[PDB]
Amino acid sequence: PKCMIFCPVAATPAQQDALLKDAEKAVADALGKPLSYVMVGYSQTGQMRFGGSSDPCAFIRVASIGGITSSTNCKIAAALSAACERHLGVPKNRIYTTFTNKSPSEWAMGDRTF
């Protein structure tokens, strides 16, 4: 699985480390996949707006080979939004999380597809 967080907040690598540790656990747990297959990252964007406001907001992209369902997506979004609020100060209601189901052939690690 993959989880990438995009946010204008200038997070210190130590905020980022704690956030990403929370993120990887939540994604592995919800999808029932080994942590060894979970990739997570933080990317500081330039400016971001949401609802016509420059107030802090975030968006996160999560992808998996299967496991993408209404219930599981909601679980992941709840956990990820809460972690961003905790670590970045971004209100959870200003965080969009979107989910993408990938076919095994659409996902490679090194020189091999799944």
Place this chain on the structure above:
Amino acid sequence: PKCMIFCPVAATPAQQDALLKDAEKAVADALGKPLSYVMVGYSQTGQMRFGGSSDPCAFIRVASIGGITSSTNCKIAAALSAACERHLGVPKNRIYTTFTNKSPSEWAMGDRTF
């Protein structure tokens, strides 16, 4: 809806503010969705190449729950490309815009899916 612009141009936050204001309006207008649900951002990439040239270029990703159609995508791309040209100096013919239709269950705000 979501619109994220990726470009190597070192845009000043004030270029970015004006760009993103143009972007949010164009996306809301084309999709007939309230501005309150529109998220927009700018991300300065490292190097980008297009057509084998390092000349300035950009790519933008736009996602929505429904509303993704040939006519509507063309309208959004016309408006977004033009805004990047105006605010960033990037020729519109060196801007790729790609569109993604999301199911409601694939999109969360805070701890709730749509």
Place this chain on the structure above:
Amino acid sequence: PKCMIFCPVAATPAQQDALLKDAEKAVADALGKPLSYVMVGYSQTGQMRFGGSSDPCAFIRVASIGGITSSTNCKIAAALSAACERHLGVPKNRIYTTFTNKSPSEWAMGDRTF
């Protein structure tokens, strides 16, 4: 086609230039599409983790209008992973490459869809 590489490595623009030249050629070759239509970029992320480790890793997103298949994806991933290893020092087995097939109507260049 589009290929975007996300990695925490602080690559010098000259590492980036060489990487992206390798990337554009490999994508054009595998998909049998003209270089004129290939867009490539590098984005230095903040922190990234993979498998519960902060050791260097990367993820790359590749999109095309058609041409996305198990064999072709594997070819592209092999070439891209190898280039990142060569130019960035990131072990190829710590690189995820994911593939997205786009409809022509979902892809615009300037003010026109494909």
